[PDB]
């Protein structure tokens, strides 16, 4: 599957970059392919919880 | 000569009453407060370029 990492995050929207280079912006309720349905935006931890249990974080080479 | 000692304790507690812990915490609360200033109401609008 296709891996994304957070390129920016503030209260509310979070801008996410993928391994394909695709860019997205998400909110509390947003459909995200593979991961499913976003559950919460954690802007100070650089964290994104989605319904599939997968945790989306800042890229390790970008944090 | 211990008068100089207690005087100097009182000194580094008044000229620099901000011991290096409370100043970093003061910076902490400052930037958290202005982050609460910066935090938008709920979800910001989605940036879209339409036609």
């Amino acid at each position: 599957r296709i891996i994304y990492y957070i390129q920016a995050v503030i209260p509310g929207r979070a801008w996410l970059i993928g391994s394909n280079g695709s860019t997205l912006t998400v909110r509390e309720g947003s459909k995200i392919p593979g991961y499913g349905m976003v559950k919460l935006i954690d802007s100070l931890q650089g964290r994104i919880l989605t319904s599939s249990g997968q945790v989306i974080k800042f890229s390790q080479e970008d944090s | 000569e211990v008068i100089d000692k207690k005087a100097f304790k009182d000194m580094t507690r008044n000229l620099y009453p901000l011991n290096p812990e409370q100043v970093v915490k003061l910076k902490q609360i400052y930037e958290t407060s202005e982050y609460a200033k910066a935090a938008t109401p709920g979800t910001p609008p989605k940036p879209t370029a339409t036609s």
Binding site: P11, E28, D42, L44 | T32, Y35, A36, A39
Partner: peptide
């Protein structure tokens, strides 16, 4: 909806 800076454990 949540302003998590207004968060507390």
């Amino acid at each position: 909806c949540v302003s998590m800076i207004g968060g507390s454990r």
